[PDB]
């Protein structure tokens, strides 16, 4: 078995193999990267996303979100409280004052250990899940607003036409920007690409231990496992490393640098912060093995984690018996 140790796997791909995107993500599997639940992927060095960052500075921000902590600082959940629209230019000057910035530090690790001291005692504001890109029409490889969509992938192994679209969504960040532990929706994989600026830093719990994380977050977050028995769909609970070590839960931690892909792999539970003013983009991706990881997904049906369209078909067709009350969560 590859990768039994189910670590976090960095690939270099050539020119030549940076050409078949389903290929090279199937040969990272050859090679066990999807146990760890992550990969890195460092792109040739031919390969460009774009030729320039000068002009996105009159991007929307339609509803930035204020990201307030409740609890204590290894163990806390946040809420979206939404702000006025502001352009990129705008945000990147808010992420940059004093309020706002990365304060000083010696290296990843000492901001690390900031992070979780504390992230808690302040509000950061991120500008997520816009819908738009920002590859260059022109770049062939990668470019992660032309990949195969997922519904075609459903096609293709199941007979099934379904409705639906797939595209793919920025997120600009700044310091303590926070991502919550979770999977993708229906555990499909996903890819994110760090356009610009400061590092992301990610936490990932191997796909075959993911209960072990469910089980500890029902322990640590008592009123919300009552409330819905698949919470974490929710997107809003945040637990240190320190608390999983002290809890015996497997997992990683890699630090994401601008010019890098991370792939994150179905039902790998994740969890991130940024480390100052940046742009990442990401979507999601099925592959033929995804199938019987959405035949198996749970599913929120308490109304909180409210989801795209395109959702709908997966739920129909993989998961006829759950859908009419997943359904009713949605309305
Ligand atoms: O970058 C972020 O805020 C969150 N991204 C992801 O969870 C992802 O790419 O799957
Ligand atoms: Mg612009
Ligand atoms: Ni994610
Ligand atoms: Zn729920």
Redesign the pocket.
């Known amino acids: 078995a590859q990768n039994p140790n189910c670590n976090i796997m960095i690939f270099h791909p050539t020119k030549e193999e940076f050409n078949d995107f389903d290929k090279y993500i199937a040969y990272m599997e050859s090679q066990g990267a999807h146990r760890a639940g992550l990969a890195k992927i460092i792109p040739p060095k031919e390969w460009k996303a774009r030729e320039t960052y000068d002009n996105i500075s009159e991007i929307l921000i339609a509803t930035p979100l204020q990201q307030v902590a409740s609890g204590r600082a290894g163990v806390f959940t946040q809420y979206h409280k939404k702000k006025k629209a502001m352009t990129v230019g705008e945000y990147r000057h808010l992420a940059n004052s004093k309020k706002y910035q990365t304060p000083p530090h010696q290296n990843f690790e000492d901001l690390e250990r900031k992070y979780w001291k504390n992230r808690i005692y302040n509000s950061p504001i991120?500008g997520?899940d816009i819908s738009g890109s920002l590859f260059d029409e022109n770049t062939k490889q990668w470019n992660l607003g032309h990949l195969g969509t997922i519904q075609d992938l459903l096609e293709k192994e199941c007979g099934v036409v379904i409705e639906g679209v797939n595209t793919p969504y920025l997120?600009f960040?700044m310091w303590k920007?926070t991502?919550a532990w979770?999977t993708?929706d229906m555990d499909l994989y996903?890819?994110?690409y760090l356009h610009l600026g400061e590092p992301?830093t990610w936490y990932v719990v191997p796909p075959e231990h993911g209960q072990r994380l469910e089980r500890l977050a029902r322990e640590l977050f008592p009123g919300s496992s009552r409330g819905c028995g698949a919470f974490l769909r929710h997107k809003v609970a945040l637990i240190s490393p320190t608390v999983l070590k002290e809890n015996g839960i497997p997992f990683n931690r890699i630090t994401q640098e601008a010019g890098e892909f991370?792939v994150?792999f179905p039902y790998g539970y994740?969890a991130?912060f940024n480390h100052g003013f940046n742009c990442?983009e990401?979507i999601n991706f099925a592959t033929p093995r995804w199938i019987d990881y959405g035949k198996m997904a749970s599913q929120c049906s308490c109304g909180e984690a409210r989801v795209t369209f395109s959702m709908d078909a997966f739920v129909r067709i993989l998961q006829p018996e759950r859908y009419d009350l997943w359904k009713r969560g949605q309305d």
């Open positions: 991120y997520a997120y960040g920007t991502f979770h993708e996903s890819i994110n992301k991370m994150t994740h991130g990442a990401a």
